[PDB]
């Protein structure tokens, strides 16, 4: 596997997935254990909690990453506030590609949930979300989306040209230019038989943004009814 040096730099910033899955699983199981039968978290609450924990992991990943760590705090804030949901979605979708299987949903805890259940025990807005998500997963599986391509898309999502009032906008332009070039070099050399892999991967970014927005609206509605676990990171990003 020929890998551009820049991508090797991006990879050194990646955490151990199986480890992260277990740590979050362990913590959730620990909290439910400390609470009474009269304060047990609902499945929805538990899912929100794991999303919050995943967000923390995402913020730590970014905070320690090359390039991003060079930005002033206020710039880091602006970038993360713009893409937090996109990263959560990209994180979820990649997990489906690597650990999931057709017909089921693989959670960050390592738990798997059949789609049939969701289609009969969930509302229209959520099923619509899962459907689109499922479409995206099917496309990445088809392309044999891999870790090198995954980290490139993460940086392209993080360093968004759409973010305004950034002090160091040049760094965003640089990441966009160089990571796009690195991704193209990578796909051309390792998946030559897929002449359009680079382009097909980029076409997924707008779809990821679209799904993230739909996901936010969904959570926002729950938020208004005060049903989402609060006093956490998930809620602050949503309430913003």
């Amino acid at each position: 596997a020929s890998i551009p040096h820049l991508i090797l730099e991006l990879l050194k910033c990646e955490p151990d997935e199986p480890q992260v899955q277990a740590k979050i699983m362990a913590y959730l199981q620990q909290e439910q254990a400390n609470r009474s039968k009269h304060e047990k978290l609902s499945t929805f609450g538990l899912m929100c909690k794991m999303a919050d924990q995943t967000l923390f992991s995402i913020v730590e990943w970014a905070r320690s990453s090359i390039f991003f760590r060079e930005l002033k705090v206020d710039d880091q804030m602006k970038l993360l506030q713009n893409c937090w949901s996109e990263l959560l979605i990209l994180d979820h979708i990649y997990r489906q590609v690597v650990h999931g299987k057709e017909g089921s949903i693989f959670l960050v805890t390592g738990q798997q949930v059949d789609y049939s259940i969701i289609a009969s025990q969930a509302g229209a807005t959520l099923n619509n979300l899962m459907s689109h998500a499922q479409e995206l997963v099917a496309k990445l599986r088809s392309l044999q989306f891999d870790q090198r391509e995954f980290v490139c898309l993460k940086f392209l999502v993080l360093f968004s040209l759409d973010v305004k009032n950034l002090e160091n906008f040049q760094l965003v332009e640089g990441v966009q230019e160089q990571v796009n070039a690195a991704l193209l070099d990578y796909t051309m050399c390792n998946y030559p038989q897929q002449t359009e892999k680079f382009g097909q991967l980029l076409l997924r970014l707008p779809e990821i943004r679209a799904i993230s927005m739909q996901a936010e609206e969904y959570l926002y509605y729950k938020h208004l009814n005060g049903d989402v676990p609060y006093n956490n990171l998930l809620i602050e990003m949503l309430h913003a």
Binding site: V59, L80, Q81
Partner: peptide, 14 residues
């Protein structure tokens, strides 16, 4: 202001 306190606290840590 209305900025995410937890996020800000995390990014502000060395």
């Amino acid at each position: 202001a209305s900025r995410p306190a937890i996020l800000y606290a995390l990014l502000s840590s060395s």
